[PDB]
Design a protein around this ligand. Structure first.
Ligand SMILES: CO[C@@H](C)[C@H]1C[C@H](C)[C@H]([C@@H](C)/C=C/[C@@H](O)CC[C@@H](C)/C=C(\CO)[C@H]2O/C(=C3\C(=O)COC3=O)[C@@H](C)[C@@H]3[C@@H]2CCC[C@H]3C)O1
Ligand SMILES: CO[C@@H](C)[C@H]1C[C@H](C)[C@H]([C@@H](C)/C=C/[C@@H](O)CC[C@@H](C)/C=C(\CO)[C@H]2O/C(=C3\C(=O)COC3=O)[C@@H](C)[C@@H]3[C@@H]2CCC[C@H]3C)O1
Lengths: 203, 208
């Protein structure tokens, strides 16, 4: 049975930032909605904030009006993520609908097939676009990857993923070697239970 | 004013739970226990900028106006309010040390906001904390949480600034987001240069 509770970091800034995105996952969505937050910008900014909230040596922090400056890239690719458990009870027999919730857990392996971690995802269908019929979702992922503890915040189109497209969400690391870095977690699916993912993070 | 005898330190709630949580994350920055011995800190400048952008993005807007999932960052036309004068009304401050300002000090301040014709166009309240003393220069840095209403726009602002530079007349800048009013869903900067210990000239620059 999948545990739906978001783990606390006990960093009160991070726990509030993550809690703000949990409020996005659990908002009331309707097929009649005419307004939404700017979810893509919100996901990107929240991931940047979570990474910035990690304490670091004084000499590493930016001066008050310093320009944006990112560190060197850390890259992990050809990662295999395999569904371990999934929980989905549709609101309607006719197919996915606005308001549906999916819970998922996965095991994570590097390209040499060594087990490197695990994640848990909570996904909400928030809108069905009337002209394309495509569904959009928001997601909150918690994971450990090679000893790096991550949160990821997603606003994505469902059909583009099912069709072999690359799907991208915003990731931040709050503990481990990548602590205080943020970037993207993107993937292409191989089946309904397996995907190939890529992590790109920078300070 | 007779019935107002202290500065209300509570942040006003928007009852948008996403915004209230975002502002609460920065309130945690203001209210942490800081000591001159600290050797690690968050990346406060980046945290302030990202949190302001997040607050503005949390404001709902028509579906036609939101970003597609993979779209590049794009900003709207600039909204500018300049030549504004802000004057301290009340200030609460009890120093921790008789020597002078020290790490951990807390200041509450309220201000009135005027245009160049001296019409009162707004008001703000600030919660200011001295967060560190730089071991090399000895300069003090502060974090601020400001709540404001300006020309009918409701604002939060998050700041990480240098104390000595402000006192010497340097331009000081904090990160602002509007959550209600004509500027709702916009973010950018609020900058000022002090004229004295009780008045400053300020400038608001915001964009979608
Ligand atoms: C259908 O289709 C499900 C396909 C399956 C392979 C995809 C995911 C696991 O079910 C994806 O599931 C998740 C999300 C989404 O599918 C959309 O946002 C997500 O976070 C994540 C847990 C995702 C996972 C693929 C591997 C990367 C991680 C981050
Ligand atoms: C800065 O260290 C603080 C923790 C404390 C410790 C020390 C006792 C220190 C003392 C020494 C210095 C005080 C003066 O120099 C303030 C001058 C006054 C005109 C400026 C502001 C009002 O008080 C500005 O005050 C604010 C901030 C700061 O002063 C720092 O960040 C801010 O947001 C805002 C309310 C600002 C306002 C000007 C108009 C725009 C609004 C947005 O003061």
């Amino acid at each position: 049975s999948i545990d739906p509770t978001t783990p606390l970091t006990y960093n009160p800034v991070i726990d509030a930032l993550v809690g703000s995105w949990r409020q996005i996952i659990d908002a009331d969505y309707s097929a009649d909605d005419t307004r939404l937050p700017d979810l893509a910008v919100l996901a990107r900014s929240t991931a940047r904030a979570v990474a910035a909230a990690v304490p670091r040596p004084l000499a590493e922090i930016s001066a008050p009006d310093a320009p944006d400056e990112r560190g060197e890239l850390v890259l992990l690719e050809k990662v295999i993520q395999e569904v371990a458990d999934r929980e989905y009870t549709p609101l309607s027999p006719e197919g996915p609908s606005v308001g549906d919730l999916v819970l998922v857990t996965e095991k994570i392996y590097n390209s040499d097939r060594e087990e490197i971690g695990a994640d848990t995802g909570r996904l909400r269908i928030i809108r069905k676009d009337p002209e394309t019929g495509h569904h959009f979702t928001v997601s909150l992922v918690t994971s450990t990857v090679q000893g790096n503890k991550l949160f990821a915040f997603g606003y994505t189109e469902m059909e583009a993923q099912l069709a072999g497209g690359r799907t991208t969400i915003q990731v931040a690391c709050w503990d481990g070697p990548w602590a205080g870095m943020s970037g993207t977690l993107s993937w292409v699916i191989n089946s309904m239970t397996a995907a190939e993912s890529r992590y790109e993070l920078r300070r």
